[PDB]
Amino acid sequence: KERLLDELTLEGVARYMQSERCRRVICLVGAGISTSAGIPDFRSPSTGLYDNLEKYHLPYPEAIFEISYFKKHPEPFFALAKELYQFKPTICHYFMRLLKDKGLLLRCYTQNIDTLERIAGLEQEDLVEAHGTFYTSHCVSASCRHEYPLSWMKEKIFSEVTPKCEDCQSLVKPDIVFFGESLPARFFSCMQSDFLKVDLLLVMGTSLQVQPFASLISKAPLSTPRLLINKEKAGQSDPFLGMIMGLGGGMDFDSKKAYRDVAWLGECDQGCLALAELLGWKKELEDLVRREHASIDAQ
Amino acid sequence: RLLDELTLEGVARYMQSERCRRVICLVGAGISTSAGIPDFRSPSTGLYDNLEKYHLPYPEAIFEISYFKKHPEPFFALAKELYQFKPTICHYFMRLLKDKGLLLRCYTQNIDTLERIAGLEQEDLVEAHGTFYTSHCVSASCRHEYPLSWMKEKIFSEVTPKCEDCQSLVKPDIVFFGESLPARFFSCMQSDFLKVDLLLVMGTSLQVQPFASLISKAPLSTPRLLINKEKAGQSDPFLGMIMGLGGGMDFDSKKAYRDVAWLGECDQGCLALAELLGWKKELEDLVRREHASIDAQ
Ligand SMILES: Nc1ncnc2c1ncn2[C@@H]1O[C@H](COP(=O)(O)OP(=O)(O)OC[C@H]2O[C@H](O)[C@H](O)[C@@H]2O)[C@@H](O)[C@H]1O
Ligand SMILES: Nc1ncnc2c1ncn2[C@@H]1O[C@H](COP(=O)(O)OP(=O)(O)OC[C@H]2O[C@H](O)[C@H](O)[C@@H]2O)[C@@H](O)[C@H]1O
Ligand SMILES: [Zn+2]
Numbered sequence: 260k261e262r263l264l265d266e267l268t269l270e271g272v273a274r275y276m277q278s279e280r281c282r283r284v285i286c287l288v289g290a291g292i293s294t295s296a297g298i299p300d301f302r303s304p305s306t307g308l309y310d311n312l313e314k315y316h317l318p319y320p321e322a323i324f325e326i327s328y329f330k331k332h333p334e335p336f337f338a339l340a341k342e343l344y345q346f347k348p349t350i351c352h353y354f355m356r357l358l359k360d361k362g363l364l365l366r367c368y369t370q371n372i373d374t375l376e377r378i379a380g381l382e383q384e385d386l387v388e389a390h391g392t393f394y395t396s397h398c399v400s401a402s403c404r405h406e407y408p409l410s411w412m413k414e415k416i417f418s419e420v421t422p423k424c425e426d427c428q429s430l431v432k433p434d435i436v437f438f439g440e441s442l443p444a445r446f447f448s449c450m451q452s453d454f455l456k457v458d459l460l461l462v463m464g465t466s467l468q469v470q471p472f473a474s475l476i477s478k479a480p481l482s483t484p485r486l487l488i489n490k491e492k493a494g495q496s497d498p499f500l501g502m503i504m505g506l507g508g509g510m511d512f513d514s515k516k517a518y519r520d521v522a523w524l525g526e527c528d529q530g531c532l533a534l535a536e537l538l539g540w541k542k543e544l545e546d547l548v549r550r551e552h553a554s555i556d557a558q
Numbered sequence: 559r560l561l562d563e564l565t566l567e568g569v570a571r572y573m574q575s576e577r578c579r580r581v582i583c584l585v586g587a588g589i590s591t592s593a594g595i596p597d598f599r600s601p602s603t604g605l606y607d608n609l610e611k612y613h614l615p616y617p618e619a620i621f622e623i624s625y626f627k628k629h630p631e632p633f634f635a636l637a638k639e640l641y642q643f644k645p646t647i648c649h650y651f652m653r654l655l656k657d658k659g660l661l662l663r664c665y666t667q668n669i670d671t672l673e674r675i676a677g678l679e680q681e682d683l684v685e686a687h688g689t690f691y692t693s694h695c696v697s698a699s700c701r702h703e704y705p706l707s708w709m710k711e712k713i714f715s716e717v718t719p720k721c722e723d724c725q726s727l728v729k730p731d732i733v734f735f736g737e738s739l740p741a742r743f744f745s746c747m748q749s750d751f752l753k754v755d756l757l758l759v760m761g762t763s764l765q766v767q768p769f770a771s772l773i774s775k776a777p778l779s780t781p782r783l784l785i786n787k788e789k790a791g792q793s794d795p796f797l798g799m800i801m802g803l804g805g806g807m808d809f810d811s812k813k814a815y816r817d818v819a820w821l822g823e824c825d826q827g828c829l830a831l832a833e834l835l836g837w838k839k840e841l842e843d844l845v846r847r848e849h850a851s852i853d854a855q
């Protein structure tokens with residue numbers, strides 16, 4: 260339990276990052292880093308997806324990604340799946356690409372399934388897609404588990420055909436993680452190793468409202484500084500009934516005892532630009548975004 | 559490793575040793591079922607399966623602070639509909655721990671007061687999910703306290719309570735979803751869990767935070783005995799899990815070292831351990847005496 264930051268501010272963190280002790284950075288990201296791109300997050304008021312599902316007549320919004328409700332009524336999820344089937348990465352994404360190219364990125368653990376991380380240039384080794392992906396789909400039966408490709412899933416989706424296994428006739432779904440579902444093994448293999456020697460955590464665009472992902476901030480050493488770049492504070496709350504975080508497993512930005520957590524409130528993109536400038540990468544970042552976006556438009 | 563075998567017998571042997579000086583009990587609604595009080599989440603019998611008459615979006619809503627401010631009628635309806643019972647053998651076993659200087663603390667999620675009626679004192683107790691005894695206005699600015707008498711009159715009168723000052727809702731200090739827990743929970747927690755030699759967990763599903771976190775707060779060497787109808791706290795990780803990652807029980811893996819599950823009724827598990835400890839007759843005599851006294855208006 261050591262304080263490495265000279266001051267609990269973005270500036271202090273930048274200074275720390277340009278030190279030699281800071282070699283390994285883990286990024287923890289959610290849907291907030293993609294809103295600037297046109298993709299809605301989940302729990303933002305009025306705007307968020309969970310406030311926009313009335314037409315599916317769910318008992319509650321999370322039901323649409325809940326494995327039991329799904330097996331019982333899979334039609335809504337696939338309707339929503341086609342209703343929301345291109346986007347470009349954000350400055351946040353390319354800031355993470357920069358971290359990678361500057362040899363500071365041990366890993367990015369993401370809750371998103373938009374693939375903007377890959378598109379931003381991150382490779383699979385760099386990525387833990389904590390909540391799955393659409394690229395591959397599987398028959399839900401544990402015996403069968405027959406794999407099916409993205410082309411097949413699309414066909415079924417836009418063909419408005421509820422996918423079934425050609426073999427067992429069971430339901431087939433994309434390997435995105437539903438509530439009640441187990442997370443990809445890679446999530447666990449990479450976590451056991453990654454968090455033992457991490458020098459900085461960068462949390463961005465997440466409300467930290469789901470487990471086990473929320474536990475990740477607790478897995479880092481107590482000395483490891485943690486910076487949240489988010490429109491609102493997350494992970495900091497007094498203990499209340501139904502809280503997601505484990506007791507003492509959250510962030511401490513403001514208490515008298517606060518020593519390693521820093522909260523920059525605003526758009527992810529602007530926090531990333533600010534940090535870059537403090538680091539001296541602002542024009543390199545800008546040029547990376549203009550170039551990549553340009554190269555994208557050409558396609 | 560402190561337990562010689564992961565069995566009730568190994569726990570009893572450990573408890574008779576000199577290394578077991580302080581015991582913390584963690585209890586839930588399952589320790590009160592044998593007295594006629596239903597739990598929350600047991601299928602069909604549990605309360606959350608018996609709230610259809612209130613037409614809730616989900617059962618927990620009836621104890622959720624937001625739905626409550628929007629729709630306070632169902633709660634009070636239930637509050638009078640569920641407004642006497644006697645403590646069970648499990649409660650008196652905890653009283654027995656108290657009488658033998660082994661009980662550091664009992665943390666309870668229950669609000670039925672059978673722990674007090676059973677003979678536990680305020681200092682022995684952490685009522686983690688509050689109490690019906692006192693009631694407060696929901697406004698943080700107001701926070702006008704009201705007595706049990708006030709709340710009863712209002713409830714049995716079918717009168718939705720309002721604050722005399724701000725006209726906002728008034729509710730008993732039982733902890734709803736979204737509500738902060740009593741400060742004493744955290745103050746007692748910080749000190750208690752540095753010096754606990756045994757966790758005894760009874761009659762809870764460990765499905766709500768921050769109470770579920772308490773098992774992770776104990777030292778890694780401290781044995782943990784669950785006495786419950788079903789195994790609790792031991793699950794593979796999944797999206798939506800309540801437990802923090804690695805914060806649960808390990809009864810059955812190859813790496814298990816300290817956690818033991820005794821599956822059955824709480825009263826029978828307490829009788830079995832008592833027997834093992836040589837306290838069974840003393841326990842049965844305590845229960846008989848105190849129940850007799852109770853019957854005596
Ligand atoms: N443009 C932005 N700039 C900065 N912060 C933002 C921005 N947009 C949103 N935020 C903040 O970003 C946060 C977004 O909160 P949430 O929408 O809950 O997204 P999640 O990724 O954490 O959801 C996790 C899981 O929940 C689901 O069940 C799925 O399983 C998901 O995988 C909020 O604090 C916003 O204020
Ligand atoms: N007679 C019995 N003997 C042994 N175990 C029993 C018995 N009866 C029930 N059980 C077990 O007892 C366990 C009771 O499970 P739950 O019904 O969730 O009660 P909680 O106290 O943990 O609820 C915690 C909070 O949740 C609410 O929101 C309130 O806020 C509560 O404070 C089950 O596993 C049964 O198998
Ligand atoms: Zn199949």
Ligand SMILES: [Zn+2]
Binds near residue numbers: 697722726
């Ligand atoms: Zn008031």
